[PDB]
Structures are given as C-alpha cells and as structure tokens.
C-alpha cells in the first residue's frame, strides 16, 4: 500500500513524470498501473506502466498530446482490480524543463574558452525562447575550485578567460536549464564534459 503520495512535474512538451513510494519491495511494471485522463469533453483514460526507482519506489512517464496552461488531469493508481489512490495534476503548476545536451568545450582559441550546447526544445515551444542556463565548471579532483555562470542571453554558448582556470589540470563542466515561466524548477544536469586545461 501507498506511503508517500504521487507527485508530478511536466516538461511542457509531451512528458509528465510522477513519483510515489510503497512499503517494502514492489515490482512496478507487473503489479501497478497509473491511469490518467484529461478533463475534457468525451475524454478517454490513458494507462501508464511504471518503472522502478529503488525497492518501494515507482516512476511513470505520462505521455501527453500537448501541454497548454489550462490542462488538468485526473490520476488513478490501481493495483490489479484494487484502486489505491485518486488524485489530480496540472502540468503548468509544476514545470521542470528538459536537461540540455551535447555540451562541448572548444580549445581552438588562446585566451578565450568557448562552451556550446543544445536547447532541448523545438523552436515552436514556449520555453525555447525562455530558457536560462547555469554552467558549472570544476577541477576534477577539487570541487572547491569551481565556477558558476548564469547565461540569460538566450543562446547556448559561454566564453571564459583561459587565465581563470589552472593549467596542467583537467576540468569538468555541466549545464542545466531554468524556465522564465511561473512555477518552474531547475532541469536535471546535462551529462558532463572533461578537458585538460593548459596554454
């Protein structure tokens, strides 16, 4: 039976991610189902088969046609023929954007470093024009030697003076995204990249 109550977030494209906790060991793909349905004329319930997140924890990725701000869903957690939980979810109240990707460092200019990466959204999504980024650089064996850069100029690039980083040392870098919308939290981190600094 259910311990902690299902909570959801939305990427504001097509995927909403929900999380709950059972007691003890549970296999989510075989035992449980999460039914979701848009409050909308003649709507049908869709069904999401969850995957496991450690022992008593499940996660579901709710596929969605679209996300607009008035969209509201009802949520029904079943366990076979037994209904465990009823709830509701509004994607525009809980935005968590996608992680950026393809993070690349460019070595080809003395004095100035160039980092590039991709916006994970298509041009016609709202967030595409409204993403802030946070770029985190640190030396691989000394996390206290770090930098954080805020990128608000709506372009997935960053330039840094090479003299700000130690030579003969290797650095890591990762990037996350923030939506200028309301009710947003930070994305996950990109995969990180590594280079040896020196000039």
């Amino acid at each position: 039976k259910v311990l902690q109550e299902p909570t959801c977030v939305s990427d504001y494209m097509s995927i909403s991610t929900c999380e709950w906790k059972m007691n003890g060991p549970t296999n989510c793909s075989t035992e449980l189902r999460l039914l979701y349905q848009l409050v909308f004329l003649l709507s049908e319930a869709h069904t999401c088969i969850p995957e496991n997140n450690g022992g008593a924890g499940c996660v579901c990725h709710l596929l969605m046609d679209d996300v607009v701000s008035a969209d509201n869903y009802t949520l029904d957690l079943w366990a076979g023929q037994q209904l465990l939980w009823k709830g509701s979810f509004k994607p525009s109240e809980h935005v968590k954007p996608r992680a950026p990707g393809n993070l690349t460092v460019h070595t080809n200019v003395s004095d100035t470093l160039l980092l590039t990466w991709s916006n994970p959204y298509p041009p016609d999504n709202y967030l595409y024009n409204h993403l802030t980024y946070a770029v985190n650089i640190w030396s691989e064996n000394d996390p206290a030697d770090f930098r954080i850069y805020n990128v608000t100029y709506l372009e997935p690039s960053l330039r840094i003076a090479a003299s700000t980083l130690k030579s003969g040392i290797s650095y890591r870098a990762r990037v996350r995204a923030w939506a200028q919308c309301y009710n947003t939290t930070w994305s996950e981190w990109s995969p990180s990249t590594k280079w040896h600094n020196s000039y």
Partner: nanobody
Amino acid sequence: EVQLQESGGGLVQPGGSLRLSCAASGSTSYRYCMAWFRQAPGKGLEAVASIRPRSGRAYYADSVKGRFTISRDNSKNTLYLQMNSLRAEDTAMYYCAASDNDGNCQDYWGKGTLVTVS
C-alpha cells in the same frame, strides 16, 4: 467573441455517408475545445465528437466510434464531421460548439444543420 456557421446537412439513405462543416469567424487554433453535439426531436443535447485544435487529438462518444471522424483545417478556420455508416438513430439537428478557457465546449454555438436518414 467567436461566431460559428454550420453547413452540409440533408436527407440520406441508411448506410450512406455525409460531411458537415463549420466555419469560424476567428482562429480555430486559439480554441481549447471544439466539438459536434446533436439534438434529435424529443431528446436532449448529446456530445458526439470533440477535438484539440492544436494537436488534432480527437475524442468520440461510443455511439459514433468507428463511423464518425472529426477533423479541422486551421488555415480555413473550419471544423468537419465525416459521417459514415449512417443509421436511423443518427437523425438529429447537429451543432458545432467551442470554448477557450475550459474543455466543456459551451461558450460558442452554431445554428445547426438537420441530418435526416430515411
């Protein structure tokens, strides 16, 4: 606010088909919900088919599933209802409706077109 005008009704043979249309005086793409409802003489209104104008995702009442198709041409601001395998039971006045802030489809209504099957 939006104005709506249906067309495409008439007499039909049981088994035959028909296509309805509903021009809108403004962008279909800014509507949240768009749908067809129907009356029938001695009876109350019932929703038949609905659509999400942006994505195109369509929904249907059981009685028309497999026979009716709802669609939209956003460039013409127009909504359609392809009606196949028509039965005597489908005899009614047919209406296009729409709404902007909720999925009830009750804000805007057309005048209706009769569909008689005999």
